[PDB]
Amino acid sequence: NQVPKWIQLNNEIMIQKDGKFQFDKDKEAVHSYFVDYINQNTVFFHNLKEKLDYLVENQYYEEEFLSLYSFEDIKEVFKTAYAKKFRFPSFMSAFKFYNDYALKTNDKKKILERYEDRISIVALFFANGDTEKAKEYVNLMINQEYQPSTPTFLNAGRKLVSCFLLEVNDSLNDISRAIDISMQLSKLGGGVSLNLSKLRAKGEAIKDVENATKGVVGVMKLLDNAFRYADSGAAYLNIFHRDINDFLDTKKISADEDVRVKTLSIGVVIPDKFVELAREDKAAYVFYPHTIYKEYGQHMDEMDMNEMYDKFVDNPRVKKEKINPRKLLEKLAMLRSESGYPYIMFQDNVNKVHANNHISKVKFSNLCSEVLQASQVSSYTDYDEEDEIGLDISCNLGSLNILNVMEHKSIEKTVKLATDSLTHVSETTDIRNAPAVRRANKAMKSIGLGAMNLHGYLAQNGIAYESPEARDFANTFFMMVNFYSIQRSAEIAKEKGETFDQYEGSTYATGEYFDKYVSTDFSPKYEKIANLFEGMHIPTTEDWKKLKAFVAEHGMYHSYRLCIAPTGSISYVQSSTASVMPIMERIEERTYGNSKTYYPMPGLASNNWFFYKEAYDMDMFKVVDMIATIQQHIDQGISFTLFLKDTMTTRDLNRIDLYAHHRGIKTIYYART
Amino acid sequence: NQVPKWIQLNNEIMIQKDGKFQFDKDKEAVHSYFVDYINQNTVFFHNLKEKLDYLVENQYYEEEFLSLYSFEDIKEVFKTAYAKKFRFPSFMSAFKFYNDYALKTNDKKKILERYEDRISIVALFFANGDTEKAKEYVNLMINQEYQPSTPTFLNAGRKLVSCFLLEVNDSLNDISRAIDISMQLSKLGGGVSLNLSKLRAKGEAIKDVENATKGVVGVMKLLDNAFRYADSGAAYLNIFHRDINDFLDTKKISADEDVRVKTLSIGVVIPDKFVELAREDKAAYVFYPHTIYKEYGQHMDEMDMNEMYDKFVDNPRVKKEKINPRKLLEKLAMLRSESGYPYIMFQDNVNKVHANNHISKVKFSNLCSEVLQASQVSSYTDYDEEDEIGLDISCNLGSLNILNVMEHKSIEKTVKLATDSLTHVSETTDIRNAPAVRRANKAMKSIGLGAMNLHGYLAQNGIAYESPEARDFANTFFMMVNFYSIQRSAEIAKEKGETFDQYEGSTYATGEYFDKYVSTDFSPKYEKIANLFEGMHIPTTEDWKKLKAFVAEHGMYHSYRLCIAPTGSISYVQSSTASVMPIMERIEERTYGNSKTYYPMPGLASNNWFFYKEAYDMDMFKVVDMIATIQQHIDQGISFTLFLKDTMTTRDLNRIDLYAHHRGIKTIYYART
Ligand SMILES: Nc1ncnc2c1ncn2[C@H]1C[C@H](O)[C@@H](COP(=O)(O)OP(=O)(O)OP(=O)(O)O)O1
Ligand SMILES: Nc1ncnc2c1ncn2[C@H]1C[C@H](O)[C@@H](COP(=O)(O)OP(=O)(O)OP(=O)(O)O)O1
């Protein structure tokens, strides 16, 4: 029943040594725990050969790509990994890896993989034939310069994507098909979310008899019950609906029998017409999209509301409903101050930067609230009858370290290796239930790249998070990685000799995304910011001009390359801080079980004490200015989590919303307290 | 609560497959148990260096002789051991080694040493400076051609002898000193036994007042109580004592309050005078050794009974006691049929072959009943007063395989390596409580060498144990190992340039032990026996003549070289049968715990089924003839365990005793039932 030594060492960290903390007690809490637990619970082997034979015979890996190398090359990459002798600085480093991310035994009572082993296997999977590229993947990974996504780093050749975005058409067979597809993907752990802007409203005529539609809320109840059969999902709605108030009745603070959501996150996508109508404080008009489909031929989200609003107003066919949009703004701010629900997307601001607007307009995002692509709704008829194959969205993840890239300065080769690995993931992944997402991943070849450790690295350098220096740092750095990513995508579309589909209507084929970058040089205007960027060439606008000429020469390979997700589940094993969102506490405190670990921030001392600020005590306006500074280079959206408190008010949240709509911010996340 | 797989596989061995047993179910009972238990409970290491650093820092070994080699040489002998990849054929092989003989952790919940590791460490300890000799020790050990003794193989350089033989003088200070010395050695696990032939009888005058001695039985009670303070011991008595009947009252079948022995084994050493007096069926005379000491000046066992018996008879000074020795023979046979107690030694028959009879006569042996050397009783006065340092006996152990030597045919180099290792053990061992045994081990330099797997190897070749072929086999083989052992001892006394002490009065300095061997060639008289010995030169009498000339040239190093002990505790890990005693069962059956292992004999099939006979169904006369055939080459005694039954009678046991006295048999062991 006795607490072991390393847990007591972690308890000893919080002992006030002259007003500070016993940080080095972590290390023994590392070092004893390696000795007393890790090295005493590992399965013994006599060599590498019998170890690999045990891995083969005990049915733990796909043996094919493992047999794409010799045993000597496998031992070479293993010796290369073990030549690091990686010394974990954090208790949570080993305390999450060998606890969760490491592949253990079948009874899960001993250790199988080491920290080098999983990384080397993932490197052999990413390289898939080459030994030296796998060693480069190791050097990108064993120095923690890159970290792949959670199922990607988890089940590389074992027994894959957490981003899925679909639509729904207005037929019962479509409803059953979508229910089936969500149940198919729910067992695979992928993040599946949708949007319901193409369904008929409550109390409408179902094709023969008047006043027959039970409403969308029954379908939401059905999907909420359907998600109770697996381990989660989400759905959206365009704002100009009569049941949009009922869309606010979903996440009601009085949890009803008739409305009881537990899994489906909601998010209201607001075009500029609604903030236009609420800004003038004039009464607005939502409509019936089935009457719109019966009158004009298309759904309401098929057309822009700013054009066709008065065209719906004067036309007597589509039935009206008149409300106050300012009261809806008040109730939205009220629900956001209650919880932080729902999400808000400025889809016109998304299309204001969207390169593939020639295909469609983005009208929704994921649960991770980051991916913004084009889409097409399918249509499913009966079983004997033939159906349709629309367009879908699937964007893989995987982050890098700002700190390790900025210290090791292999940034272009980092872009090379990360792009090749994400290309390999997009190539290998296949879906055999809904062929629409299969066709979409086959057609778009879309990837998503992000990064972490912004506040911890820059605050570790002695730079405030609320500095314009850090904003210019993000500006120049993401200009450089934008240069390298577009350079790599154009090189890859050259080397393949082939680009993604509908590349010609995008801004890359016309060079319009580079039109911002052929002028307006984002060279560092601050001295410490430039000195951090010293040691490497900063690409100017002429480099962007040659990049534009090379893109117009061949083409670009990925319709999207970048997304930013809250990838906080891997910061501990990356021995690093979170993503570009600033930290909340200098010391995380957890009760693991029968214990209290006290994990401080990595690099926490008294010099960066006030550089490691608190998220409850920051100006959010400088944060969204930084968000816009980063969004100057990101194609897709960024999951900006709002860091708020309980004492704030709804009208200041409204001012934040007007400020973000003024900044052209794409999406927002659930708020803090 | 479920029985694991390998135990069920061992249970599957006894399943009657067409009247036989499922022998190969052992192997999976090996092989799964290696997989499911052994390789899952070993402490992980990254290399050899950190493993040795853990062994150093965790205080597991004497680091000095380990630092007498480079890390590369240690890795060379480790690679040499692991290049064997020794495949255990028996369940009891791993089931005793990694259970008991392997050094485990401090909490004893994981494995530290491997099967190669302990052997290689023992080899480095035996070599103590040389790498190649340690590899030769490995090849002698990893092929199971030699096995050292239990503490020697156990604690080689860790945190030593099981043979100790002392005497007692007739003073209270001597009694307290001997009690102290036995208590000193009892905590060290050594086998300590004594003899009480120099104490005054019961009811005698203690130096001033008549009828004051409480008797020897109180001292035996005291030693029995004293052995209750540690984890065992023994004591003897010469037969011509008045309390010798009381010596039979010790192991009384009615366990008394007043006599309650639980640890002290007894054994009556019978000279030829007693079998002379019992043979003629005439009344015999025991005496009072204190009156003998007061009259003639010496104890009774100082002089021969055959000479001085009538000189004690006609002298009126020494008080007589007249008994029937045939009734004592009857009661001795009765107690031997009850249990098997006590032991019987024909000390005149021992001195009939004893080379160092110029020193003294052997009057006692150990609990292992094998070692027969010369001795001198000490005398201890008061604490301020000065004492005496007599002579003692300490003979180390360690056996070899008849099977592996007879198959690998490195018999002379086996003698070389075994003699050098036993020399190293005798050099390193030191005692710091009783300096008499320290002086005795420093002076005699006496070793003991034995062997095992006689019945199993020869019966595995298709030879009956009750054959004269096997007797001639033992004759020729032990002639050859006698040749090689005397050759090695003479070579060693040449290389040192120095022999043991009082070598000149021994028969080796006069060549009288070779006088039996300069004639009477022990070449094999049987064809299969010779064909087993074919492939190597058999030394004739001329080789013994050159050996005699080389011994007379320099000298011999060890006063004794050979002893045979029941070393059955290591046959399982040696994957072999017992010593030269024949087997009792073809299949040992044990209930380990919550289980029933069924370990057959190694090599048990239907062809050697009737070669693997049963010890209850053999002629003991052929066995003692084989014993005499072996004793034709052994210097010391051999622990011949009597294999008897319940249905036999005491008079046949008497005929066995007369037959063994006719054969010149030195000692006998406790009998079977
Ligand atoms: N931070 C850590 N990261 C990885 N392994 C560790 C860490 N801390 C302790 N250990 C491991 C390595 C060893 O197997 C054991 C502790 O030995 P350690 O001294 O840390 O390594 P080492 O063997 O390279 O150095 P040394 O030769 O001084 O013992 O547990
Ligand atoms: N009995 C019903 N109760 C509730 N909803 C129904 C019922 N029958 C059909 N629906 C729902 C599910 C459909 O998405 C929606 C439209 O009805 P359905 O007849 O299936 O579409 P449809 O393809 O034949 O053409 P239309 O859109 O004109 O109705 O109403």
Ligand SMILES: Nc1ncnc2c1ncn2[C@H]1C[C@H](O)[C@@H](COP(=O)(O)OP(=O)(O)OP(=O)(O)O)O1
């Ligand atoms: N009799 C045995 N003696 C020693 N080790 C054994 C024995 N039986 C099984 N094992 C050990 C060796 C391995 O670590 C594991 C079982 O693998 P095993 O097949 O026996 O050895 P191996 O690796 O040399 O052959 P293979 O390449 O065919 O697997 O447990």
Ligand SMILES: Nc1ncnc2c1ncn2[C@H]1C[C@H](O)[C@@H](COP(=O)(O)OP(=O)(O)OP(=O)(O)O)O1
């Ligand atoms: N009070 C006693 N009770 C029992 N035994 C005793 C007693 N005193 C002495 N002894 C025993 C232990 C001795 O071994 C033995 C001889 O007595 P002790 O006086 O100690 O010997 P000693 O060396 O003085 O010469 P001696 O042999 O003539 O007696 O008798």
